[PDB]
């Protein structure tokens, strides 16, 4: 099964309403594993299975790093604002991470955003930064001049990130590697006169990845299908739905290697 490890950083200039100047959160798939902010000034585990396997002395080194990274972010956003001739509150974002796919192959990514829009995207294969505009182009040139940092990121993405991901997957196996099959139902109702609506509703499933489709006489529908988002139920499970307007219909649900058909 596909798994991912991700670290995000969010920087805000001139924050109001208790919003921290800096937040950093780590995830394994949908699950938060670590947190740091400019208020606590401390890196802490956000999952019981992280706290249970990593001694409090492990977070000591990460606290220092994050304080240093918090300072760099503040400086970088001040520089970005100057380049764009921008006043007031602006945000700077970073995402680093890797995926371990089902086939055993891997992906790595490193990107920045200014005001929630793509800014700089790392290319670990050509060892370069893709810039959206001229301000990003200026940053790109300064970063590309540092060959060492680039090779270090490629290594971290391809090697270190994967080794951490595998280690965290072992710690959180009872959560991350479990399967809770969906409970699926089909509801039929007459809506506007003549118009019949069919809804395929699934709930109580984990992992959140599910494929839900509507078919007509065993073949795919060329009519409009409505899709409900995969939503967290609040207990570690998810829910989703798919609807069609009936003019031999069946709902096809795939989840974790189990295919399920519900005919109307």
């Amino acid at each position: 099964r596909t798994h991912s490890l991700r670290y995000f950083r969010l920087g805000v200039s001139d924050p109001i309403h208790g919003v921290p100047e800096f937040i950093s959160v780590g995830y394994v798939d949908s699950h938060p594993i670590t947190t740091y902010d400019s208020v606590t000034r401390q890196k802490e585990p956000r999952a019981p299975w992280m706290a249970e396997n990593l001694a409090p002395d492990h977070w000591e080194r990460y606290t220092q790093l994050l304080r240093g990274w918090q300072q760099m972010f503040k400086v970088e956003l001040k520089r970005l604002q100057r380049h764009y001739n921008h006043s007031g509150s602006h945000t700077y974002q970073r995402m680093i991470g890797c995926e371990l796919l089902e086939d055993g192959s891997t992906t790595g990514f490193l990107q920045y955003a200014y005001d929630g829009q793509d800014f700089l995207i790392f290319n670990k294969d050509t060892l370069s930064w893709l810039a959206v505009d001229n301000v990003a182009h200026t940053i790109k040139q300064a970063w590309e001049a540092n060959q060492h940092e680039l090779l270090y990121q490629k290594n971290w993405l391809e090697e270190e990130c994967i080794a951490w991901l595998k280690r965290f997957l072992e710690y959180g196996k009872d959560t991350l590697q479990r399967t809770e099959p969906p409970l699926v139902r089909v509801n039929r109702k007459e809506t506007f006169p003549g118009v019949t609506a069919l809804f395929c509703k699934a709930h109580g499933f984990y992992p959140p990845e599910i494929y839900m489709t509507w078919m007509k006489n065993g073949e795919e529908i060329v009519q409009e299908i409505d899709y409900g988002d995969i939503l967290p139920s609040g207990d570690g499970t998810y829910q989703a739905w798919a609807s069609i307007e009936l003019d031999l219909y069946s709902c096809h649900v795939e989840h974790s290697g189990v295919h399920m058909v519900l005919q109307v």
Epitope: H58, Y62, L65, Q71, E160
Partner: antibody, heavy 108, light 113 residues
Framework: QNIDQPTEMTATEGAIVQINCTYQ??????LFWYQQHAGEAPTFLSY??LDGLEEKGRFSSFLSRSKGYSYLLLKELQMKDSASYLC??????????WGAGTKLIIKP | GVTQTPKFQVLKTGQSMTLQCAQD?????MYWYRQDPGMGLRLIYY???????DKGEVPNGYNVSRLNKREFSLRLESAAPSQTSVYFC?????????????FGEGSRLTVLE
């Protein structure tokens, strides 16, 4: 883990010397070579993180990730090359681990 | 680059000592190491950026102050003979460092009964 390098090495003036360094078995974020003359501060020579040979004048730094080792190759040895060579590596928690250093003696 | 004072010092057991270190390279990260025969440099304390400091491998008997972006002082409040050593201050642009670590000239400290 450990960073291991020979305590001392002796070679002849004009010849070639290879200083080996075996590093930590867990976590790797790069390897450095530093030069240190007797009574002086260490000075940076190189940083390696990916596989290969980086050449910088009479000095070359090699890294093998699979083999877990690095070497500092010194060519056409000079008396001025008499110094200690420090190997240092970055672990999975970005902590720098230092080797004890290899004292290099040049026979004129 | 990195200016470290003093180069030489003799202390009596119990005496206080401050080692000064300054860099004008606009570096964020500063470090204090000690060098002893037969072993690799050992980190006493470090400062990842201005406004933060933390213990290294050998913090006992020392304390530090990251006074501003430029300065990182090392204090021995009550000198002990085991503190006889060569002390190097260093700085790097950021932490983790993949570039050059810049060292001060060294401070040779002798603590005697």
């Amino acid at each position: 883990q450990n960073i291991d390098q020979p305590t001392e090495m002796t070679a002849t003036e004009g010849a070639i010397v290879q200083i080996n360094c075996t590093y930590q078995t867990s976590g790797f974020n790069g390897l450095f070579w530093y030069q240190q003359h007797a009574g002086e501060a260490p000075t940076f020579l190189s940083y390696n993180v990916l596989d290969g040979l980086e050449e910088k004048g009479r000095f070359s730094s090699f890294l093998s990730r699979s083999k877990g080792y690095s070497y500092l190759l010194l060519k056409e040895l000079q008396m001025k090359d008499s110094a200690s060579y420090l190997c240092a590596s970055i672990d999975s928690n970005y902590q720098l681990i230092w080797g004890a250093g290899t004292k290099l003696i040049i026979k004129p | 680059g990195v200016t470290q004072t003093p180069k030489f010092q003799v202390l009596k057991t119990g005496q206080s000592m401050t080692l000064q270190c300054a860099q004008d390279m606009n570096h964020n990260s500063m470090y204090w190491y000690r060098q002893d025969p037969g072993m690799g440099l050992r980190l006493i304390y470090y400062s990842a950026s201005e406004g933060t400091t933390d213990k290294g491998e050998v913090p006992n008997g020392y304390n530090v102050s990251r006074l501003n972006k430029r300065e990182f002082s090392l204090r021995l409040e009550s000198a002990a003979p085991s503190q006889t050593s060569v002390y190097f201050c260093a700085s790097s642009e950021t932490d983790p460092n993949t570039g050059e670590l810049f060292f001060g000239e060294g401070s040779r400290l002798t603590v005697l009964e």
